Each structure stands twice: as structure tokens, then as C-alpha cells.
Design a protein around this ligand. Structure first.
Ligand SMILES: O=c1ccn([C@@H]2O[C@H](COP(=O)(O)OP(=O)(O)O)[C@@H](O)[C@H]2O)c(=O)[nH]1
Ligand SMILES: O=c1ccn([C@@H]2O[C@H](COP(=O)(O)OP(=O)(O)O)[C@@H](O)[C@H]2O)c(=O)[nH]1
Ligand SMILES: OC[C@H]1O[C@H](O)[C@H](O)[C@@H](O)[C@@H]1O
Ligand SMILES: OC[C@H]1O[C@H](O)[C@H](O)[C@@H](O)[C@@H]1O
Lengths: 368, 367
């Protein structure tokens, strides 16, 4: 049973970090998760009985540590573990360094699409070179990510695609609880479109909002998720968009919620609307596992998760009218829509069961 | 005429840093010296009209949050043609900026990269970054070159280029000599001057042991600064001094800028490092002041001095062997003065800043 030091730059519970809980959990006995900032994510790992430590760049190897204490601390810690598992870009930088100095093999779990759209040239160059030189293995969360890695100059022979896994039990809610929650929200007699991405222009909440202007008034949207600071302009732009379309009573922000399965159960349609390619899209799968019909943007790993008209729908990114037509089709073809949504659950529960992903990972790890 | 970004970790004017003034001065029109800390060295560069900027780690890539200084240096480097790294930390940073800004890197090596001077990590880092990113590794001594290579460095990257010196600075009036010896209260002493920062490996404590084995008109001046945290060493010297009844024969002058003058005021200059010296600027300085110099037999000292010809050499750690040389300088005044006088002629050939500067410029243009 390996000793694994996991590293993640964020103290916040984003996709990558949510995914790491499931990645790490089977190793929680002899493992540790290193965060480069404190926040909600630490609590989760605590709540999941995973050892976590927050590293800082405060002072206290060699003298070179004064340049970057965080790195020195991590390098020091790395001596105690058999493996460095880096879950984000910054964690790859630090984990490369500590891989070399502490003489421990390094795994890069890639949750991003390394394209010019998504990141600066510099970030692409660094990640590719550090991975190519120091990573024993690059686990990609999707083929779209693997492909982007390769096109940015990454070494194909290092890559292995492994999708996110999910606890299937967590995705079932009582139909009373659904009635309760729809009530509490004041949407019980609406057609509820749920959007579950953190608030950020490229997640395209503003595309959905534009689409409501072409839907009948019983169609309402809940926007769930927070804004990561820097994107507070976007939060303004949404409310100014709503005001400008008279949608004040049809769009609700709940901010960041821990009760996503329940909320998905309370929706009628889950919508993924990213205007830039999505590496994976946890929400897409999550919807499918909650028996809900999902529409998604046709790019990135979304196209791997959904086939249009069989287990979900797919629309041109940034095209609100197209999204509207799907919402309206859902309203009418009740029988079809529910078939698609029930198939989606069956199919998705095969690919993405956390049990099958965890063994796909452990097999991958022990083979080096 | 290339724009050069010189980098140096220190704000204090140590040996490598003083060396850098002479390295950089001919390029000051289009160059910049970036320091990772502020201090007197900045002032010096200002006084020599060499542009200088202090970088901090206060808040390219989002990655720059990991190490802001690195991000600033990387940014700055887009405006220059070459990056010239003069210390170990400056190599780390400069390697990173070399990659990201796609600018060639030169590493000026002033250390002896051996397990005695540095941690394994420090060796491994410098060698690996140098091997991978440096177009050229300029060593200050064959001793330094060798230790690089023995630690894994790439022989074919190395070129030994010795420190240079302005010859016009190393001359003093007999009258000025007398005043200074007077001010110091040593006019009828045999004066041994030790011109090194106060760290155990500079071996002031060895000279002190030697004094007790010297004739009684012999006194020492220790010229140099102590770091905070090597104050425990300074206390030991003072205790040692007292233990040997030498309170009135050893005086500390702290850091001083009038080095040529103070060397002139000495009768002997003594280099006593207990660990191999990469180069030893004070040894050459002494020779350029026409004084007899005794040095420790190790590192790049052995390249500067042949024992009995232009100076003396002694077994590191061995005080008694140092005494014999002092005694000898006292007894054979004419021999010594010839050795001392030869030393100046010999050293003024090799280490003339002019000839070293040419040596550097031909190395740099050939790229
Ligand atoms: O307010 C929110 C928004 C999202 N999520 C969860 O976090 C994931 C969001 O990650 P996704 O892959 O959708 O986008 P990312 O954040 O990874 O770019 C989803 O699966 C949700 O279950 C959440 O708990 N609260
Ligand atoms: O009190 C002092 C001691 C030294 N120096 C100068 O700093 C250099 C010391 O460098 P050296 O190579 O002797 O020792 P390092 O500190 O470089 O190891 C000499 O050339 C001196 O000119 C000085 O200005 N004041
Ligand atoms: O599984 C990893 C998840 O988070 C990652 O950061 C990606 O951005 C997202 O596409 C994916 O759904
Ligand atoms: O190269 C100039 C000086 O640099 C180094 O720091 C050495 O410690 C010293 O021996 C050398 O003379």
C-alpha cells in the first residue's frame, strides 16, 4: 500500500479538488493531501477522514529555500512518501521540484485542457516541459484533455485517460424531498432548468439566461455555484442582463451549495453551457446519475459524455436560440425526454462508477 | 553592444559582488544589475554608474504567485539579450528566466562546489541547472572548475577567467602609510593584516594562535564584517585573544573601504582559510600593494602563489607553520622584500582588469 503525497494548489472545492477526494480516499491510511491555501476543501477532506496539511510560503535542504519556502516545506515532506501525485498546475511545478530533490516518482493528474483559449503560453510551456521531464505518468480526465496535452507538445506515451468517478448511492433523492425542495425554492409549478457551474464567463450562465428570453414564462432557472474573486464583474453582468430582459422572477442564484444531488432532483433539465471547451464536466455526469435529462455544450469532453438524442443533448457553444429549442423540446416530448434521461442514468452508471474508476487507477499506479 | 542582465543574490559587497563591478562596468551603458536584496552593494554600483535594481518577493503566469521575484526577473529579462548569473540563487532564478524568456544564460561561478562548502541539494541544483540552461560557465579558478566537474558539471561548458583589478588603486604614499600606521597605533609594530569577513572557515582563529608563537612586537589587524549569527564566532575570537594574552596585540577594524591603504600599512598580509578558497581576492590585492602575502595551501590560492617566489603557502589549520613564516619575514627582510616586489610585478601581469576584461569580452562575443 503506497505512501502517497497528494498536492493541490487550491483550498476551495472546485472540480479537480472534488475529484481528488475520490482519488485519494482509498489511500487515506498512509497518504496526505497538501494544499497551498486553506479553505472549504480542507474541511471536506477532514470530513472524509483524509489527512490534509496546508502549506504556506512563510519562512522556516539548503539556502535555496528562501526563494520559495512552500517548495522547501513540500520537498522536505516528500521524503516520507513513495509517490508525488500532483493534481493541479502549481502543484506540478512544486511536485516536479520535490520529485527531483527528494528522488520520488511523480504523477500528474491533468484536469485541464491545455490550450491557448484556456491558459497563457507560459503556463502551457511550463506544464508540458515539467510533465515531459519529471512525470512518470500523466492521468488525463478525458480524451479531449489528453489531446490538448499532446498538441501543446506533451508526450503521448505518458498519457492515460481516466474519467472522474462517482458514488452512485449519493445520487438518489426521495420524491417527497423533491416536492419539499421544489416548494422551499418556490418553483413547484415551474419547468426548472438547473445550471451548476461556478460563476465565470466561460461557463456561460449568460447563455442560458439569454435562452430564457425565448422560453415560455413557466421556465425558470436556478444558478448554483459561487464566483471565484476576480469574476465579481461577471456577477454584476448577469444581474444587469436579467434586469434588461425582465427575468427578475425567473432566475435564482443560490450560491455555493453542498446538496447538489438533491437540487438536481428538483430540476427538470440540467444545463451545461460553457462557451469554451470543457475538460470533463462533472455536472453533466452528475445530472445523468440523478436520472435527469441534460443538455450540454458541444466541445471538449462533453462530446465524450453525451450523445445527442440518446443520453442527453448537445448544442453549439454560445448559441442561446439553439439551447432554447432544446428546452422547449423537453417541455413537449415528455415521454421521449424521460426515456433519454433514464437511459442516461443506466449508461452513465456503467462508465463512471467510482468503484470501477478506483480500480482503474490502482491498477495504473501499481504498474510502475 | 549587448544588453546584459546581471543577477546577484546579495545586497552586501562580498567578493563575488566586488568582482561583478569590474565584470559589468564596461557594459553599464546597456546593462542592468539585479539584486535580490538591498544594501551597500547597491550604493557601490550607483557610485560606479552601473544601473541597478533591487527585486523583492512581494506580489507571465499565474505561477508567479509561487515566487514573485522570479516573475519580475523573468519579465525584466525580455528587454535584455543575455542573462548573467553571478551567484547560486541567481542561477536558480536566471535559469528560470532563461527558459521562459528564451534568453541565453551565463553562469559566473565564484564558489567551490564541494561537500565542504555546500549541501548536496545545493550542489545538485547548481550543476543540473548549469548543465541544462547555461551556455557558459565562467569559473574564477581551476580549483572551482575542477570542483564543478567533480560534482557532475559539464567540463565543456567551463572557462577559467580570473578576477581582475584596477592597478591604479593599489598605490599609496609613504606619508599616507605613516599617518595610517600612526592612527592605528602600530608605528613600531610588525603588522600582520587579515582582510576577510569573520566566518570560522576564514581562519582568523588560526592567525591568532600563530601570534602567540611570534615575536612580541608583532600585532594583527582583523579587517572585516561579521554576519549576525556568526557573532558566536566573534565572541570565540575575543575569548581566544584574551586566553593567550593578546588583548593589546589584535585589533578589529570592522568593515573598511580603504583596503589598499590598510594593506600598505601592514608588513605582512595573511590569508588563513581552513577550507579551500575559490580565488582569494585579498591575496592578489596584497601582491598588487607590493606586500608579502602568506596564504593557505588549497583551492585557487595555489594558483596565485608559488611558495618562496611571490608569496608563501601553508598547511590549512596549522598555526605553528604560519608562525614560522612570520618569524621568517621578520628575520630575512631583504629576501621578503624581493618576494614582495616580485609578487607585484608578476601579479600585475595576470590580474590586470584590462587584460581580464578583454578575456571576458572575447568569451562573450563568441556565442
Ligand atoms: O455550487 C456548486 C457548484 C458545483 N458543485 C460541484 O462541483 C462540481 C463542479 O465541477 P465541474 O467539473 O462542473 O466544473 P469545474 O469547477 O471542474 O470547472 C460539480 O460536479 C458539482 O457537483 C458544488 O458542489 N457546488
Ligand atoms: O573588510 C573588508 C574585507 C574585504 N573587503 C574586500 O572584499 C574582498 C573579499 O573577498 P575574498 O575573496 O577575500 O573573500 P570572499 O568574501 O570573496 O570569500 C576583498 O577583495 C576586499 O577588497 C573589504 O572591502 N573590506
Ligand atoms: O474531473 C475534473 C473536473 O475538474 C477539472 O478541473 C475540469 O475543469 C473539468 O472539466 C472536470 O469536470
Ligand atoms: O571570485 C571572487 C570571490 O568569490 C567567492 O565568493 C570566493 O569565496 C572568493 O574566494 C572569490 O575570490
Amino acid at each position: 500500500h503506497m505512501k502517497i503525497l497528494f498536492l493541490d494548489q487550491s483550498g476551495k472545492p472546485g472540480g479537480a479538488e472534488l475529484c481528488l477526494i475520490d482519488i485519494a480516499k482509498p489511500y487515506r491510511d498512509r497518504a496526505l493531501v497538501g494544499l497551498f491555501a486553506d479553505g472549504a476543501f480542507k474541511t471536506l477532506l477532514e470530513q472524509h477522514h483524509i489527512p490534509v496539511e496546508v502549506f504556506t510560503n512563510q519562512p522556516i535542504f539548503g539556502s535555496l529555500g528562501q526563494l520559495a519556502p512552500l517548495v522547501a516545506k513540500v520537498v522536505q515532506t516528500a521524503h516520507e512518501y513513495d509517490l508525488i501525485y500532483a493534481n493541479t498546475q502549481k502543484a506540478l511545478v512544486v511536485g516536479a521540484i520535490a520529485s527531483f530533490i527528494a528522488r520520488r516518482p511523480l504523477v500528474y493528474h491533468l484536469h485541464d485542457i491545455l490550450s491557448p483559449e484556456h491558459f497563457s503560453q507560459t503556463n502551457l510551456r511550463v506544464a508540458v516541459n515539467l510533465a515531459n521531464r519529471f512525470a512518470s505518468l500523466v492521468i488525463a480526465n478525458s480524451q479531449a484533455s489528453q489531446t490538448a496535452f499532446i498538441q501543446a507538445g506533451g508526450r503521448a506515451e505518458l498519457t492515460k485517460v481516466i474519467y472522474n468517478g462517482f458514488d452512485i448511492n449519493l445520487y438518489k433523492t426521495s420524491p417527497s424531498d423533491i416536492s419539499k425542495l421544489r416548494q422551499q425554492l418556490g418553483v413547484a409549478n415551474n419547468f426548472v432548468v438547473g445550471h451548476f457551474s461556478r460563476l465565470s464567463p466561460w461557463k456561460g450562465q449568460h447563455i442560458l439566461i439569454d435562452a430564457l428570453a425565448q422560453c415560455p414564462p413557466q421556465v425558470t432557472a436556478i444558478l448554483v455555484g459561487d464566483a471565484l474573486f476576480g469574476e465579481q464583474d461577471y456577477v454584476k453582468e448577469l444581474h444587469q442582463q436579467i434586469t434588461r430582459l425582465g427575468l427578475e422572477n425567473r432566475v435564482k442564484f443560490l450560491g455555493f451549495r453542498a446538496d447538489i444531488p438533491q437540487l438536481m432532483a428538483a430540476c427538470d433539465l440540467v444545463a451545461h453551457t460553457s462557451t469554451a471547451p470543457e475538460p470533463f464536466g462533472r455536472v453533466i455526469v452528475e445530472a445523468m446519475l440523478c436520472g435527469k435529462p441534460v443538455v450540454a455544450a458541444k466541445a471538449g469532453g462533453a462530446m465524450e459524455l453525451v450523445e445527442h438524442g440518446v443520453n442527453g443533448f448537445l448544442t453549439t457553444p454560445g448559441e442561446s436560440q439553439e439551447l432554447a429549442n432544446i428546452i422547449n423540446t423537453c417541455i413537449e416530448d415528455t415521454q421521449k425526454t424521460a426515456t433519454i434521461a433514464s437511459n442516461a442514468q443506466a449508461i452513465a452508471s456503467q462508465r463512471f462508477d467510482v468503484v470501477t474508476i478506483n480500480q482503474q487507477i490502482a491498477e495504473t499506479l501499481s504498474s510502475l
